[PDB]
Amino acid sequence: GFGCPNNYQCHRHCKSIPGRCGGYCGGWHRLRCTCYRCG
């Protein structure tokens, strides 16, 4: 989902999410987009 395991599509989803900076496809069969909070 969220354009996985594509890094560009997964990163685009993390960018639209508020309180984040980047992300990656991993968690559920490399299909979930895991984004981290920007420091």
Side-chain angles (χ1 to χ4, degrees):
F2 306 109
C4 276
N6 199 279
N7 285 100
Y8 196 80
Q9 296 276 91
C10 195
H11 203 114
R12 202 177 133 134
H13 171 61
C14 300
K15 287 245 169 175
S16 49
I17 299 156
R20 259 96 144 106
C21 242
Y24 68 96
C25 289
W28 184 80
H29 303 149
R30 197 170 158 207
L31 289 165
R32 186 74 175 213
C33 267
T34 297
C35 320
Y36 32 83
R37 275 166 200 134
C38 208

